Amino acid sequence: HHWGYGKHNGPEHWHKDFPIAKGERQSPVDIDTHTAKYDPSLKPLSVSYDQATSLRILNNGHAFNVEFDDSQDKAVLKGGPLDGTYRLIQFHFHWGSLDGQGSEHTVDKKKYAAELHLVHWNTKYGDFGKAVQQPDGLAVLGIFLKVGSAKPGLQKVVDVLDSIKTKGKSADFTNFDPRGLLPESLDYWTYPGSLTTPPLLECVTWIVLKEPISVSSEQVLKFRKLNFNGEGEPEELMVDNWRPAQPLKNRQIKASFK
Ligand SMILES: NS(=O)(=O)c1cc(C(=O)NCCO)c(SC2CCCCC2)cc1Cl
Ligand SMILES: [Zn+2]
């Protein structure tokens, strides 16, 4: 039946329902750090999350989303490679069954334990659903996670996961500050790509930070206790919910640094 990450419905099957899976600007990609060229014309990124209003956390059967009120200009991304203003709508993660895999992007073929995606939509198109129909509709800030020291700012998310164990469960999640998930440096790579989940639309400017954040083994172990299945169905741990790297094709990855 429906797409997922399992034995029979995972990434290698998605093209049959979503032929753009084999398109010309698919994500994620391996970032070859020696080939990415420093681009002096990029700007510092502007991440303005001071007025971010979180509302709720949802297990959607693929990952979990932390949702924001995007009905006004509050939490916005701009600058860097972007023109105009992009509003935060949600964040989620991809992660592995073991610490040696889980990220979607890779760096010189290195896999991180997990990757955080902060999803934003371009306010010139009025709403998220119109934005995903445009080549410059979305901007995703991607952040790698390695296992080491705990990330204090992640603990509020970790502790609510037992309340949204299974697909379709949600919980109130107000007053969460996403600034606590950022690394110290905003040095980044950028390229034109796609959603990494069906429908795989080619509507995303990717901005991938170079500096990972560190989370503890105990924090990532709580992610791995979530379930892909619904309540009362046989348990399928939510692990390995990442799409592998796709062909770069006719694209350049640009560096904001060096
Ligand atoms: N992994 S990613 O490329 O950052 C990305 C993921 C999703 C997303 O939440 N996917 C889960 C299955 O729908 C969404 S929202 C989703 C996709 C379009 C229709 C609305 C649901 C947007 C992005 Cl950019
Ligand atoms: Zn994602």
Curated annotation (Swiss-Prot):
Effect after changing T196 to A/C/H/P: Strongly reduced activity
GO cellular component: apical part of cell; cytoplasm; cytosol; extracellular exosome; myelin sheath; plasma membrane
Record note on what altering A63S does: 2-fold decrease in enzyme efficiency, as determined by kcat/KM ratio, and efficiently inhibited by chlorzolamide
Effect of N60T: Reduced activity
Effect of V119 to K/R: Strongly reduced CO(2) hydrase and p-nitrophenyl acetate esterase activities
Outcome of mutating L195 to E/H/R: Strongly reduced CO(2) hydrase activity
UniProt effect for mutating H62A: Reduced CO(2) hydrase activity, rescued by 4-methylimidazole (4-MI). Reduced proton transfer. Enhanced proton transfer. Enhanced proton transfer capacity
Impact upon substituting Y5H: Reduced proton transfer rate
Name listed for the protein in its UniProt record: Carbonic anhydrase 2
Organism: Homo sapiens (Human)
